[PDB]
């Protein structure tokens, strides 16, 4: 709160970088996590037209 309009919007809609470790993990579960994060369905501000996806790095 108390942010200026542009910084507040930038913070709200910024895209975060997540790291998944695929060692011994099922590719399906990895893909479910990655797909949620990529779509942005993990954000309460989510919307299909808001382009609110995040970066997922799977090692």
């Amino acid at each position: 709160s108390s942010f200026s309009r542009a910084p507040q919007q930038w913070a709200t809609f910024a895209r975060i970088w997540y790291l998944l470790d695929g060692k011994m993990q099922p590719p399906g579960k990895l893909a479910a996590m990655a797909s949620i994060r990529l779509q942005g369905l993990h954000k309460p501000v989510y919307h299909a037209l808001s382009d609110c996806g995040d970066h997922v790095v799977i090692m």
Binding site: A6, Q9, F13, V45, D51
Partner: protein, 166 residues
């Protein structure tokens, strides 16, 4: 028929105040009922759009299309009337702001086919319109730079609102 292009030369603007930019001169000229397809004339019109008068004349003098000679004659007449009547100081200080071809009044003829059947030829006529504006030709629109593209993308990103909520 409509003849508004000719009338466009008769509009008289009020005298400009001393502390006002000099209004560039505008000359509207046209040729009516040219025995040429408007579709074919459109290519020459588009070619000469936005070019200086001298460059347009040079390009038209070395074009093989029949319409090129007609457009060159029209442009020369426009230049002459711009100097004589519209108080344009320099012949060369004119650029083609507008150049288009329009459908003219066409005639219908019969084209005989092989088995007693026929088609309806159209003796196509076209109009040609030009507006000559005094001053150097406006610079061509520069291509979009990577910096401009990135700026537009970031502006679009910043314009995002939380849709369908409080």
């Amino acid at each position: 028929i409509s003849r508004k292009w000719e009338k466009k030369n008769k509009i008289v603007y009020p005298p400009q105040l001393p502390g006002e930019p000099r209004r560039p001169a505008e000359i509207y000229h046209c040729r009516r009922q040219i025995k040429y397809s408007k579709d074919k004339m459109w290519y020459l019109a588009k070619l000469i759009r936005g070019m200086s008068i001298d460059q347009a004349l040079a390009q038209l003098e070395f074009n093989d299309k029949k319409g090129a000679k007609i457009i060159k004659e029209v442009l020369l007449e426009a230049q002459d009337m711009a100097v004589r009547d519209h108080n344009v100081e320099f012949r060369s200080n004119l650029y083609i702001a507008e150049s288009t071809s329009g459908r003219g009044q066409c005639l219908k003829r019969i084209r005989y086919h092989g088995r007693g059947r026929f088609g309806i030829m159209e003796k196509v006529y076209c109009h040609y319109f030009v507006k000559l504006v005094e001053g150097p030709p406006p610079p061509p629109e520069p291509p979009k730079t990577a910096v401009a593209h990135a700026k537009e993308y970031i502006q679009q990103l910043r314009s995002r609102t939380i849709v369908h909520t409080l």
